[PDB]
Amino acid sequence: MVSYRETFKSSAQVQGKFSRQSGGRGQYGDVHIEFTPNETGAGFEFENAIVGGVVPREYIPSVEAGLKDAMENGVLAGYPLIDVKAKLYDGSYHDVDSSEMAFKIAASLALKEAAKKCDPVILEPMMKVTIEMPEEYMGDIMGDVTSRRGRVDGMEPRGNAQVVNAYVPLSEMFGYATSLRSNTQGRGTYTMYFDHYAEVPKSIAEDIIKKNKG
Amino acid sequence: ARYLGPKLKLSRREGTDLFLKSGVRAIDTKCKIEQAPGQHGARKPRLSDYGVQLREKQKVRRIYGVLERQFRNYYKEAARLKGNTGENLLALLEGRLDNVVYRMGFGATRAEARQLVSHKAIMVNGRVVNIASYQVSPNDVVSIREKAKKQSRVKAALELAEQREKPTWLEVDAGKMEGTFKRKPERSDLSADINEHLIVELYSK
Amino acid sequence: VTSYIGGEGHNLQEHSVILIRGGRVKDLPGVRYHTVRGALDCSGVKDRKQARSKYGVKRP
Amino acid sequence: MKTMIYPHQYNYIRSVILRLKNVYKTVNDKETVKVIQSETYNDINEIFGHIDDDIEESLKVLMNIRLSNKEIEAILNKFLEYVVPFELPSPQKLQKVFKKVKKIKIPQFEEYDLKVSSFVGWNELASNRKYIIYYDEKKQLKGLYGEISNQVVKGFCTICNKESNVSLFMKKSKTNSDGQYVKKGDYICRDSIHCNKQLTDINQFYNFIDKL
RNA sequence: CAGAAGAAGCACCGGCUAACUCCGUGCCAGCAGCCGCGGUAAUACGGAGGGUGCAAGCGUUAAUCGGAAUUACUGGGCGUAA
Ligand SMILES: [K+]
Ligand SMILES: [Mg+2]
Ligand SMILES: [Mg+2]
Ligand SMILES: [Mg+2]
Ligand SMILES: [Mg+2]
Ligand SMILES: [Mg+2]
Ligand SMILES: [Mg+2]
Ligand SMILES: [Mg+2]
Ligand SMILES: [Mg+2]
Q1: From CA B132, how far away is CA B115, in angstroms rounded?
Q2: Which helix (DSSP H) or strand (DSSP E) does residue A126 occupy?
Q3: In what helix (H) or strand (E) does residue D75 lie, and over which residues does it extend?
Q4: Span A5-124+196-214: which CATH code?
């Protein structure tokens, strides 16, 4: 199972407001949170932009916890949200109504609102692959990498053997060994190392969303 | 171009009241004048001759609220002007409109006077002047603006001025809130505490 | 010429373009110049909070 | 004297040895094998810099295609001796590092773990944080506490760059008078010891610290 | 007319030279105009607190004269220091 992740393609400013009566007690939480794309590998970044008097200080940590939990849950296919920056630019509250849970729900609502306007996209893990094989089978190796949607960055010759460096999706990478043995006639070896998370092809991504949906 | 930090700290460093407060309450109640500012202020280090000269020059600057560049230019003018350089230097600082307003009692402190001068509440010879550095000549009349007369601060300042000793070279009238710079202040009129020679020496250094 | 690289740590490599200023380094014979930190390829010292202007460090 | 190698280097040595050996298992072409033998031999030599007779003996066993996993273990154990253990700070010093956290408690760390520890990290459940102590490029001990997610998910760990059970770790910036603070974090292995063993490059951990 | 509202930084604190402690490091990392400082109680390195000096600037580098009576006209020397 390939560990796909989600990120927001477009930055958006959204307001999440929750107002409801629970157990005979009104609960009102409002949070206005800006979600922006983050640099690859930067990870989740949260900034508190509340000067004060717009959100109760006690509820602010709860809001952050809600966002964190929602990212873990995922907004599209349920893949963990990554490379997103969250900033609580504005908020509103009622002393009696406001509660930690209410604000946490409001944060979740904000992230749902963000998901609508942030253009979230699934990210697939990309593995850098170094393959050593005889030059005779090198053309076959090139074809296999192309078939797996991998791109060969460069080719390096070491003696008789030829070294190929390419970046291939992990999903595509599975079963490479068997193919390599067939292509090289068991005369080639390869090593793959994870490099980065890259956006899934839209057609594939759509299918993945459908699969996770059902 | 102005010092916006704590006033009493400056007084504590000098170890003397620099008249940076109105004087409604004693400086001692407000601060520990004896002790120098900071962690190591309580200990008294031996002061070098350079240090003694510096601290004298710093005192005068802090009293009149003049930065070094402008104070240097005053010294050069005092040296250029005929007579005692040190006495000339003190006369120039006294000649400043800022000082005159405070001495006339329109302002409680020289900083208060500065705000009055700055905010166009002061007229010299019936013309509005907003320069603190403006030099008031003999026979000039400094009058508060008619609009500014209504301000409460001016009235309170005049009462505090009554407690202070009245400058001989300045004639002032309450209610009218106008004053005349009759003559340039003599060295005798100014406080003997200030050592002009140290400042002259420091600049000769 | 030989130029001393001031501060703790540097990113200088061969072929790096740097700006040098006057300043001998006693104890290093023949070093009559200092490289200006924070100028051209040379970068400011990381996590420096005092004399930042001397080591090309922006206000934290 | 015996060569001294960093823990991350030893992990790389282990990885290359396993990689080198796997070639013997799979690759049927002696020519291809030979190329990798030389590459790995160089890599091991490079890490050691100087190879003693004991390393040479191990290298000879490594070069042979008849190398066995039991032999590998023995070779690794010898290489482990060359490795230098992480220096634990004095308990007083630790508290000085974590001035903000009074009466910070440290669990007992295994000597082997210390030997293979590029960094030392311990998680407190009550804290809900992971406390990490490490020596930087300057070799000053650096201690940091950041919130660790209770939820664990399978994903590539930032520190080691290996897919494992990871929990999001967030480091909070110093709170201003307003009460505004910025938290920056990335998913990392929940177990520091496991991550340490996985980690082969000290720089990767440093990069994660830079991100914080 | 409205409202303190919209407006403070830079260098330095061993001696020379105005301004001192703590912590970290332990001839390392570094500093440095000069004399020097750093090998486990560093006012000298790095950070912090406090302080000093200047201030929309402050430092650094380069450059000239000064201090330099150290080319001596003003205004020096030559027994042993040239
Ligand atoms: K002569
Ligand atoms: Mg100016
Ligand atoms: Mg001193
Ligand atoms: Mg010490
Ligand atoms: Mg010069
Ligand atoms: Mg001369
Ligand atoms: Mg002579
Ligand atoms: Mg002789
Ligand atoms: Mg002779």
Answers
A1: 9
A2: strand A120-134
A3: helix D69-82
A4: 3.30.230.10
The answer to whether residues D161 and A194 touch, using CB atoms and an 8 Å cutoff, is yes
Q: Which residue bears the tokens 């406390």?
A: D131
D26 vs A contacts (CB less than 8 Å): 177, 181, 186, 189
Nearest Cα neighbor of D47 from D62, D33, D64 is D62
| C7 contact residues in D (CB cutoff 8 A) | none
As a whole number of angstroms, the distance between CA A134 and CA A151 comes to 19
Three-state DSSP at A30 gives strand
Q: Minimum-distance ligand to the CA of B51? A: 3
- Give residue B204 CA to ligand 1 midpoint distance, Å: 29
Query: What letter represents residue B11's amino acid?
Result: S
Cβ–Cβ under 8 Å, residues D128 and D147: yes
- Alpha-carbon distance of D159 to D156, in angstroms, equals 9
Distance B54 CA to ligand 6 centre (A): 30
Rounded to an integer, what distance in angstroms lies between the CA atom of residue A68 and that of residue A35?
Answer: 13
Q: CA–CA separation, A198 vs A40, rounded Å?
A: 9
* D135 CA – E39 C1', rounded, Å: 22
Closest residue by Cα to residue D2 from D42, D43, D56, D71 = D56
In angstroms, what is the C-alpha Rg of chain C? 12
* Class level of CATH domain A125-195: alpha beta
Question: Domains (ranges, CATH) in chain B?
Answer: 7-93+190-204 (1.10.1050.10), 94-180 (3.10.290.10)
Whole-angstrom Cα distance, residue C30 to residue C17? 21
Give this entry's resolution in angstroms. Answer: 2.4
